[PDB]
Amino acid sequence: PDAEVQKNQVLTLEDWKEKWVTRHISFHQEQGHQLLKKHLDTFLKGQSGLRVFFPLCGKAIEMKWFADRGHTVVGVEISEIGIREFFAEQNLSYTEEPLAEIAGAKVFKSSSGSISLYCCSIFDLPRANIGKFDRIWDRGALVAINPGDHDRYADIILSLLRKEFQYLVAVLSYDPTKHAGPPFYVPSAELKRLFGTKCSMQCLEEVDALEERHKAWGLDYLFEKLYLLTEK
Numbered sequence: 001p002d003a004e005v006q007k008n009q010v011l012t013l014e015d016w017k018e019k020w021v022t023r024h025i026s027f028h029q030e031q032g033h034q035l036l037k038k039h040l041d042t043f044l045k046g047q048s049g050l051r052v053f054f055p056l057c058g059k060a061i062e063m064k065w066f067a068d069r070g071h072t073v074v075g076v077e078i079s080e081i082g083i084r085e086f087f088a089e090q091n092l093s094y095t096e097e098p099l100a101e102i103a104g105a106k107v108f109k110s111s112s113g114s115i116s117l118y119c120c121s122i123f124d125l126p127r128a129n130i131g132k133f134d135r136i137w138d139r140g141a142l143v144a145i146n147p148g149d150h151d152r153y154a155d156i157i158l159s160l161l162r163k164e165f166q167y168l169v170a171v172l173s174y175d176p177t178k179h180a181g182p183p184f185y186v187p188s189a190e191l192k193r194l195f196g197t198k199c200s201m202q203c204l205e206e207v208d209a210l211e212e213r214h215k216a217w218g219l220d221y222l223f224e225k226l227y228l229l230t231e232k
């Protein structure tokens with residue numbers, strides 16, 4: 001069945017680091033995610049000072065959209081190059097500090113603390129004691145995790161959530177035989193299976209996402225879907 005075509009495909013931490021060194025970062029959206037933009041006011045309606053977590057954040061420009069609006073932002077990214085590029089691109093000063101609980105890892109914080117980006121693996125993050133969050137934006141994250149690590153990833157995400165929460169996750173649907181991930185194919189049913197017990201799920205959107213750079217992979221279709229998950 002389609003959903004397990006990719007079951008044993010992996011990209012390692014070192015592979016990701018190398019994509020950044022060599023500049024293979026086609027996943028970055030220079031003008032930021034359009035569905036988040038459309039849904040942002042609602043994601044944030046009537047609250048101020050939320051804690052927002054960005055798994056596998058790369059240099060996502062939407063982190064600056066939350067910090068700008070008075071919210072605290074935490075991200076995790078294996079690549080120091082991506083982390084430093086975010087700060088240079090967003091024109092913010094930052095400090096760098098080692099994390100003792102995680103060997104070789106460190107945290108980069110904007111000068112006034114609004115944005116903290118942990119340079120480590122998401123699987124190691126729990127040892128960094130980062131607290132819990134009201135909000136999670138997940139794009140190019142759950143879809144970049146190796147299929148084999150889905151259950152581990154999902155338990156991390158769930159342990160990072162406060163009792164009341166909004167969790168926006170963006171997934172891609174395409175034919176898994178015609179492209180070896182990332183981005184991996186994460187169907188609705190996989191989402192339901194990982195979070196369905198702890199979260200109510202609502203599909204907010206589903207736009208056609210196919211473009212020339214995708215016909216190149218051999219893709220004849222590509223749909224982007226945005227799910228909102230909240231408490232039960």
Ligand SMILES: Nc1ncnc2c1ncn2[C@@H]1O[C@H](CSCC[C@H](N)C(=O)O)[C@@H](O)[C@H]1O
Binds near residue numbers: 140
């Ligand atoms: N286990 C892991 N822990 C932390 N970062 C990881 C990771 N696996 C992959 N990454 C990083 O996660 C990113 C996924 S690509 C998408 C980046 C970002 N969310 C965006 O929308 O642009 C890459 O930057 C990769 O360096």
Ligand SMILES: Sc1ncnc2[nH]cnc12
Binds near residue numbers: 040042044
């Ligand atoms: S993003 C978001 N958050 C909460 N409720 C919603 N309804 C539609 N979009 C929503």
Ligand SMILES: Sc1ncnc2[nH]cnc12
Binds near residue numbers: 027139141144182183
């Ligand atoms: S995470 C990721 N990696 C590569 N390409 C992508 N497109 C959308 N998300 C992506």
